[PDB]
Write a protein that binds this ligand. Structure first.
Ligand code: BRN
Ligand code: CA
Length: 223
């Protein structure tokens, strides 16, 4: 997260870190045994780390649970990032508590202007690189689809939405991928892609979770 702030320990209790020996993506706990992340976060050997604040220090609220199954969206296209969503089932149910909590799926879609919380352990610099140890947060509005498609001509699909600030300075970034965009208590977005980070007129692009609620629910129910 570039231009964000320190969330505060466990203030984003659905935020998970995907760990393959190191944090490589965020995700969101959607129930005790399921995380949603970006399909582009797919890899083998995922350990889901819940209750994390400082990802480099065991602070006492963590649960580390191995993925038992990853399910990349059937239509995920890695070239375009269309359908950049993946479900990860945990080998065992997370113990739910104030610091490890699921985030509600939308029952529809959010609108341009809705303020969302985007969070992650991604890069905090727009030029160069600095990785935070503690979870960073960003309040950002959903941008109109038109501004989104204007910022990224030919690349924005109906499964993507932009959020953030056309002026630059405030954005998600590498390392935030797969993590949540939560608007009005619902996971509306997954950190998906962008051009650089926090650059003028290059807002974050997020997987439009509301398009996937049927698939998420059906997939979870069947798995
Ligand atoms: N500007 C954003 N909102 C945003 C920008 C980039 C982003 N990147 N995610 N992942 C990502 C993963 C790997 C590389 C790499 N091969 N070096 C670069 C980026 C995730 C979000
Ligand atoms: Ca920790």
């Amino acid at each position: 997260i570039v231009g964000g702030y320190t969330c505060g320990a466990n203030t984003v209790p659905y935020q998970v870190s995907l760990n393959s020996g190191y944090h490589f993506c965020g995700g969101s706990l959607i129930n005790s045994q399921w995380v949603v992340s970006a399909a582009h976060c797919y890899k083998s050997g995922i350990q889901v780390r819940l209750g994390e604040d400082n990802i480099n220090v065991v602070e006492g609220n963590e649960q580390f649970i191995s993925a038992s199954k990853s399910i990349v969206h059937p239509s995920y296209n890695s070239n375009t990032l269309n359908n950049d969503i993946m479900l990860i089932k945990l080998k065992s149910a997370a113990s739910l508590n104030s610091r490890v909590a699921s985030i509600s799926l939308p029952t529809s879609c959010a609108s341009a202007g809705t303020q969302c919380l985007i969070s992650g352990w991604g890069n905090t610099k727009s030029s160069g690189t600095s990785y935070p140890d503690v979870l960073k947060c960003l309040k950002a509005p959903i941008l109109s689809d038109s501004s989104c498609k204007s910022a990224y001509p030919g690349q924005i699909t109906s499964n993507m939405f932009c959020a953030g600030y056309l002026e630059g300075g405030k954005d998600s970034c590498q390392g935030d991928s797969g993590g949540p965009v939560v608007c009005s208590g619902k996971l509306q977005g997954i950190v998906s892609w962008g051009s650089g980070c926090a650059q003028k007129n290059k807002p974050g692009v997020y997987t439009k979770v509301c398009n996937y609620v049927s698939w998420i629910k059906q997939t979870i129910a069947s798995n």
